[PDB]
Nucleic acid binder design. Structure first.
Ligand SMILES: [Mn+2]
Ligand SMILES: [Mn+2]
Ligand SMILES: [Mn+2]
Ligand SMILES: [Mn+2]
Ligand SMILES: [Mn+2]
Ligand SMILES: [Mn+2]
Ligand SMILES: [Mn+2]
Ligand SMILES: [Mn+2]
Ligand SMILES: [Mn+2]
Ligand code: NA
Length: 326
DNA sequence: CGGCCTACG
DNA sequence: CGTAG
DNA sequence: GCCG
């Protein structure tokens, strides 16, 4: 009917229940801030079910039988339908705790546990953090230094410019190596928090050692403001007319044997991939990550040449990236 | 009861 | 701990 | 919070 796992149904980028899903996602985020990943996941799964529906929900009746809707999520929807507002959601969004945890966790290098410690210490603003720089890692220092730019949506023109300089550096580092745009932009998003790239080479093994060489070539062109291997979480100095802006870029290398798995994982959405890995293990007895798909009884890895091969093997109807917006 | 994705830096 | 989708 |  409505399948229970998000990887079993198409979720388009544009859907029909934004008001309801956004309210449930507030509660999910707040559950995360209080350290309950289980409640976070339920609220995100409920919100995702609404994104997959073909029409607006207008009456409580339409939730009957939907997976991940129980008493709490149904009451939130009921109050939004009846009153236009959910008291619990409004109390969360106006709370000092929620607003400060959101502010701090949005910083690159800061998660819930760090944000919660700072909150318990009385810190409330970005200026509070900057005044106490000894309590910051180098990663957090970079996230705070570039926070304004990193809060500006990344546009497609930015993606295209970044893809060009990444392709130039990759080609200088290793002839024949390829760059694939992944992440939300591959799912059709028009804006993003960052740009994700996946790099490989058609000859297994030639990509060994590639990422440090790419990073050196980008840094020699003055393109790198921060970096810290096979995954590089960077901040680039992106030229703009007369100036520049900082942009988060993730660069990932995989051998071609792993490419379909890495492409699938890095294309998301986050919830889609968590649900796909859960489905794989719990329903099919196979272990999925961005490196492979492992049968733990035969002790063998599935050889995939495409994302479609992975969906088949898991017994799932193929979904293109633009239907993975769970 | 107890799981909730599964990696790398 | 942080990062990722 | 929901569900296997
Ligand atoms: Mn539609
Ligand atoms: Mn409740
Ligand atoms: Mn009422
Ligand atoms: Mn991204
Ligand atoms: Mn690896
Ligand atoms: Mn990214
Ligand atoms: Mn329990
Ligand atoms: Mn993400
Ligand atoms: Mn509980
Ligand atoms: Na963060």
């Amino acid at each position: 009917w409505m399948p229970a796992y998000a990887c079993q149904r198409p979720t388009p980028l544009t859907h029909h229940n934004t008001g309801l899903s956004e309210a449930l996602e507030i509660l999910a985020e707040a559950a995360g801030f209080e350290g309950s990943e289980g409640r976070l996941l339920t609220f995100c799964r409920a919100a995702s079910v609404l994104k997959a529906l073909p029409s607006p929900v207008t009456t409580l009746s339409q939730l009957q039988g939907l997976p991940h809707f129980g008493e709490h999520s149904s009451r939130v929807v009921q109050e939004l339908l009846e009153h236009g507002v959910c008291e619990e959601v409004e109390r969360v969004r106006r709370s000092e705790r929620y607003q400060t945890m959101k502010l701090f966790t949005q910083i690159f290098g800061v998660g819930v546990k760090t944000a919660d410690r700072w909150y318990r210490e009385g810190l409330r603003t970005l200026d509070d953090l900057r005044e106490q720089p000894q309590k910051l890692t180098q990663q957090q220092k970079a996230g705070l230094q570039h926070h304004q730019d990193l809060s500006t949506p990344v546009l497609r023109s930015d993606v295209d410019a970044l893809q060009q300089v990444v392709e130039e550096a990759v080609g200088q580092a290793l002839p024949g190596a390829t760059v694939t745009l992944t992440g939300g932009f591959r799912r059709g998003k028009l804006q993003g928090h960052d740009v994700d790239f996946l790099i490989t080479h058609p000859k297994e093994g030639q990509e060994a050692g590639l990422l440090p060489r790419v990073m050196c070539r980008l840094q020699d062109q003055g393109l790198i403001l921060y970096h810290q291997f096979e995954r590089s979480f960077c901040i680039f100095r992106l030229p703009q007319p007369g100036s520049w802006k900082a942009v988060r870029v993730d660069l990932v290398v995989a051998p071609v044997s792993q490419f379909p798995f890495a492409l699938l994982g890095w294309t998301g959405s986050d919830l889609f991939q968590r649900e796909l890995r859960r489905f794989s293990r719990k329903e099919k007895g196979l272990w999925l990550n961005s490196h492979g798909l492992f049968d733990p009884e035969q002790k063998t890895f599935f050889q995939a040449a495409s994302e479609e091969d992975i969906f088949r093997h898991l017994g799932l109807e193929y979904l293109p990236p633009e239907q993975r917006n769970a």
